[PDB]
Every structure is written in structure tokens, then in C-alpha cells.
């Protein structure tokens, strides 16, 4: 099984999935290795390879730090890369159904990991299942992350910024150039990714160089307009200058800085990445997308406002408990072996952790806004609230506002809300339907009866895979005609969305609209407070109210002690 | 709405404008406090 490409013939391997066969080509090179002088530059076109490359094993994963917070715990370790780290990492993997399709729709997977981590070789990204079940071709590639992907000195072609994004774009070009040899249809191309994959695809809707290489787009829990997604031009440059300082590369001009930085070991960069930002969050992106003038010719909200983007159909959705993953990575009191009941003061300290630079009135107002209890005292109130706070602030409403604004220009958008908690989740119950733990369902793992999932999870995964495949093929995420819930378009008026769980899928409207309304239409105006006052009358009131109630305490029993 | 008026709005009034009315209120608190010497001289 050998396929001739423009660069040469490539050999793959057959895998047996559900009684059928998929042909896998793992670790196909798509660019020149970014070593030496090519380190930090834009990607260079791959010229030619030597004889037939045996694409029968996963390649090295690209250099990244590893999550080691829970040694031996499957919940965290299943996302860490399971092969060697290296700078020579621009490779892709392709899974094709057997027998060969003649004009198949292609799904392109873009891993996430907050632009700092991730790899395409995770078990949860094995594309053999989707290829077996929906007879489509799936391709995924490794792309540079961190400073290596996004060190920015814009205008300088030695390190212009957004290199990882330009890697993605060149990979798309490679797909356009080569997919026909795999039996693919270059006019039916669908991109999908999560948390940073979705941000990237959404940026390809804005990037003129990306304007003609794909058809549709699926965005799982993410978009560029999230506050952590894109760094301003001069904050990026400042961070670059600071990394240079940390590494002994502060120089007169830019090219001397890069000359010394091209000689540093990847590990030195990795160990220095964490100090370029004075007060970071668990979602802080030290080096990420910016307005480079090439990929982003302007601030994304402005480009978005003017309708200058690819007019196509989109599929967008989120998980029920997006925010739960981050509290156990820094906030005091939380633990995966605890029930994590916290107090008001612990809550407030968590607020200070996730919102370091926000004014005091901002904290008071998020606190006030999130404590309108349905039922009290109810001990789990504050814990869920803080998780609910981070997710609301970071994810759902910007994603919805993006959908709203995209749909205002006339294209069909479809939104889902995944609400099922996996039966194999190793994390405690209180963390619910966690961030990133829908992907295994996206990839079809519960269809495999040997995997200890429930029948209901198989049924669910079949239904989402069917609707997804229909969306890919037709732009409409229907399942069947008759006895199937229709997925209506998301319109800015009704704002209908689809609930996703094993009991019953149904249509609801304006998910948590009042909270997200707070974050988009009130919260921006709170950083405009800017009033640093003498604080002495404020601290005086602070002592004064305790003076009041400590004064109250006296005559409670002064009258009795008589 | 009442949750807003009793539990948020007062702290919003806690910033705009700062003048000697706080010192007026401390004068009121000193007048609230100076009686407690006779409560200190209850039996003692």
C-alpha cells in the first residue's frame, strides 16, 4: 500500500477497526525542519524526500513542557505527549478508510492545549474511528507551540510572530496540493479544533491567505475574542524583549537578539517562558497570536465588525463544566481527592488569583452578581460559583457573541451544549463535564464496546458523529428525517441551541444569558473605573463597619449582666 | 431588585464623593462612645 505524492511515494499501514480496515500514514513531513537558521523563521516549503518513507509510526512530539502535577494519574497524563521531544516536529498523520474513497470530505484536526502544549499523537486523537464509521479522510498535523511557535518581533522576517499559525496555513496549502492523491475533494474541506484549534480556525476565517482552502468550520469551546486568546502587539513585543533579557539576548538591534536566541537549547526557552508575564493566570498565553500585519492586518474585532471574512457555515459548541479544570492548578483549598468546600474568603482569594489586575469594585460586583442563590445555605454554592465564574468569563458568551455577530452577516450557525458526564471519568464527581473531556466522544471512543463505556454513551456518540458527518457533507447537522430532533439555525433573535446528553436532546434558548450579558456588557466598563482614591476613607469604612458590629456585640449581654 | 438595593448599591455610593460627613459620623461615633465610661463605672 504505497501512494505517490508530488514529493514522492509514501508507505502506510492497515489497522483493523470494527471489522474493517483503515490505512494510516503517520508522521509525513510537510516542511523543512526548523533547525539552526530556520529556527524562529517562517516555515519553508518542503522540497523533496528520498525514496519511499515508511509512515507506519507516530513521529516525535514537538518540544513542550509536560503536565506532571499528578504522577501516575490517568486523568492528567492522558494528554501529555508519549514520544520524544524535538525541534524537528513539522509532521502530519493521515487516516483514510479502506477501500479508497473517490471524492471524500476531509476533516482536519487541530489539537488544543492553550497554545503552550499538546500533540497529535494522543490516543484520544486517533482518527481511525471516524474514518471507519463515516468513510471520510482525517488529517492532523503537529504545529509549533509556545515561544517557538509565537515569538514575535513583527516586521522582521527572521521572527515575525504567529509562526505556528503560518505553519497551519502552509499545512493547509500542503493539503490542497496533495489531498487529490489520497482520494480527497479539495472543494469539500472542513477544519475543526478545540480551545486553540477553534481560535486558529476562526483566525483562518479572517486571514486572507486562508481564504480559499476550506469550506466549513467546527469550533469547540473557543474563539479569538476571548481575553486570553490574543495578545496586543506591544505586549507581545515586550514579552519577547523580556524573554531575551531572561536568556541573555538583550541586544542593540533585533537580529543580534535572534542570533543568540537561535543558539539556545529548547529547554532553556521552556524554563524561561514562565517569567515574561508578572501576574499570569492558569489560562495565560505567554506567546500566542497577535496583530502581525500579515496574518492579522488589524485587531480582530474590527475586522469582524466589517464583515471581511469567509462567508460560510459554522458549527460551534461547549461543554457544561468548562471551568472546573483550572481551580485544582493553583487555587487554595481545591483538590481532586477533596470535596473542595470553600468559604467566602477562599472564593474571594480565588477571584484575586484568576483576576489579578481587576479593581476592587469589579471583584465586589462579580461576587454580588454570582451569589443570587436559588437556595441557601447549600454548602456547594461558592465552589460551583467560582467554576461558573471562570467559564462564563472565559468561554461561552464570547463564543456566543462571535456566533451572533457572524450570523448578523447572514450565514448559518449551529450551537451545541454537551451535558453528559462520562462514565469513565477518573476525576471526582464535583468537576462534572470537564473541559476537553468531550473530545473522546468527538473521536468516537464509546462506539468501541471493549472500552468500558455504557450503551447510552455509544448511542450518544453515534448520534453526534452522524449529525457532524451530515454537517460536513451538507452544511446541515441533521441526523435522520423522521423521529429525529431537528437542529435549527442560531439566529440573533431566538438564539436557539441544542442540548447534548444521553437522556434526551432538546432545543433551548439563551443559555446563561444574564451572566454572560454581565461579562460582555458590564464587565468591560469596570476596568474603566481607574479611580485610585486616598483609600483612607475606604479603609475607615472598613474598620467602621466592624466598629459598628463590635459595638453591637456589647449591649447584647450588657443588659443581661446586671 | 431589592437584593441590588440593599446589598450592592450602598457599596457603590461608597466611592463617589468624599467629604467631612465621614468626620461628622466619627463625631457621632465619639458621641456614641463617650457614654461608656459610666458603663465602665457601673460598679467600678
Amino acid at each position: 500500500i504505497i501512494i505517490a505524492t508530488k514529493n514522492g511515494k509514501v508507505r502506510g499501514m492497515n489497522l483493523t477497526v470494527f471489522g474493517g480496515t483503515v490505512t494510516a500514514f503517520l508522521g509525513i513531513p510537510y516542511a523543512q525542519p526548523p533547525l539552526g537558521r530556520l529556527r524562529f523563521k517562517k516555515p519553508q516549503s518542503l522540497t523533496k524526500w528520498s525514496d519511499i518513507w515508511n509512515a507506519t509510526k507516530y513521529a516525535n512530539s514537538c518540544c513542550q513542557n509536560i503536565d506532571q502535577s499528578f504522577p501516575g494519574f490517568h486523568g492528567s497524563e492522558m494528554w501529555n505527549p508519549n514520544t520524544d521531544l524535538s525541534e524537528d516536529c513539522l509532521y502530519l498523520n493521515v487516516w483514510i478508510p479502506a477501500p479508497k474513497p473517490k471524492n471524500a470530505t476531509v476533516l482536519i484536526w487541530i489539537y488544543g492545549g492553550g497554545f503552550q502544549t499538546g500533540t497529535s499523537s494522543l490516543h484520544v486523537y486517533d482518527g481511525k474511528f471516524l474514518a471507519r464509521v463515516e468513510r471520510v479522510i482525517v488529517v492532523s498535523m503537529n504545529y509549533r507551540v509556545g515561544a517557538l511557535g509565537f515569538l514575535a518581533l513583527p516586521g522582521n522576517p527572521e521572527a515575525p510572530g504567529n509562526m505556528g499559525l503560518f505553519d497551519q496555513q502552509l499545512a493547509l496549502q500542503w493539503v490542497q496540493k496533495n489531498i487529490a492523491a489520497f482520494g480527497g475533494n479539495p472543494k469539500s474541506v472542513t477544519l475543526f479544533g478545540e480551545s486553540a484549534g477553534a481560535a486558529s480556525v476562526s483566525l483562518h476565517l479572517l486571514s486572507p491567505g486562508s481564504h480559499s482552502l476550506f469550506t466549513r468550520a467546527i469550533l469547540q469551546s473557543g474563539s479569538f475574542n476571548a481575553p486570553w486568546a490574543v495578545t496586543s502587539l506591544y505586549e507581545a513585543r515586550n514579552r519577547t524583549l523580556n524573554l531575551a533579557k531572561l536568556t541573555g539576548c538583550s541586544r542593540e538591534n533585533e537580529t543580534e537578539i535572534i542570533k543568540c536566541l537561535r543558539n539556545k537549547d529548547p529547554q532553556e526557552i521552556l524554563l524561561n517562558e514562565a517569567f515574561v508575564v508578572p501576574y499570569g493566570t492558569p489560562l495565560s498565553v505567554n506567546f500566542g497570536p497577535t496583530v502581525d500585519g500579515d496574518f492579522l492586518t488589524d485587531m480582530p474585532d474590527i475586522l469582524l465588525e466589517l464583515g471581511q471574512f469567509k462567508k460560510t457555515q459554522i458549527l460551534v459548541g461547549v461543554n457544561k463544566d468548562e471551568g472546573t479544570a483550572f481551580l485544582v492548578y493553583g487555587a487554595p483549598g481545591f483538590s481532586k481527592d477533596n470535596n473542595s468546600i470553600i468559604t467566602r474568603k477562599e472564593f474571594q482569594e480565588g477571584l484575586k488569583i484568576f483576576f489579578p489586575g481587576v479593581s476592587e469594585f469589579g471583584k465586589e460586583s462579580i461576587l454580588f452578581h454570582y451569589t443570587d442563590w436559588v437556595d441557601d445555605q447549600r454548602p456547594e454554592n461558592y465552589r460551583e460559583a467560582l467554576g461558573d465564574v471562570v467559564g462564563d468569563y472565559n468561554f461561552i458568551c464570547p463564543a456566543l457573541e462571535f456566533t451572533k455577530k457572524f450570523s448578523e452577516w447572514g450565514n448559518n450557525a449551529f450551537f451545541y451544549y454537551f451535558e453528559h458526564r462520562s462514565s469513565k471519568l477518573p476525576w471526582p464527581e464535583w468537576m462534572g463535564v470537564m473541559h476537553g473531556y468531550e473530545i473522546e466522544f468527538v473521536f468516537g471512543l464509546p462506539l468501541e464496546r471493549r472500552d468500558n463505556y455504557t450503551k447510552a454513551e455509544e448511542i450518544l456518540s453515534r448520534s453526534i458523529v452522524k449529525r457532524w458527518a451530515n454537517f460536513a457533507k451538507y452544511g446541515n447537522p441533521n441526523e435522520t428525517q423522521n423521529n429525529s430532533t431537528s437542529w435549527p439555525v442560531f439566529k440573533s433573535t431566538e438564539q436557539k441551541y441544542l442540548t447534548l446528553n444521553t437522556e434526551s436532546t432538546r432545543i433551548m434558548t439563551k443559555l446563561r444569558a444574564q451572566q454572560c450579558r454581565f461579562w460582555t456588557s458590564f464587565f468591560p466598563k469596570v476596568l474603566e473605573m481607574t479611580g485610585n482614591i486616598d483609600e483612607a476613607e475606604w479603609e475607615w469604612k472598613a474598620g467602621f463597619h466592624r466598629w459598628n458590629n463590635y459595638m453591637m456585640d456589647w449591649k447584647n449581654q450588657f443588659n443581661d449582666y446586671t | 431588585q431589592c437584593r441590588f438595593w440593599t446589598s450592592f448599591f450602598p457599596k457603590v455610593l461608597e466611592m463617589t464623593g468624599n467629604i467631612d460627613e465621614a468626620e461628622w459620623e466619627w463625631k457621632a461615633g465619639f458621641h456614641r462612645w463617650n457614654n461608656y465610661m459610666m458603663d465602665w463605672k457601673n460598679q467600678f
Binding site: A536, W554 | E23
Partner: peptide
């Protein structure tokens, strides 16, 4: 007991 005392203000 006899109660905690008041705190005075800082004026500017």
C-alpha cells in the same frame, strides 16, 4: 466584659 474600644479616624 467592658467592650472593645473604638478606633479613631485618619483625616487628610
Amino acid at each position: 466584659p467592658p467592650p472593645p474600644p473604638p478606633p479613631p479616624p485618619p483625616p487628610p
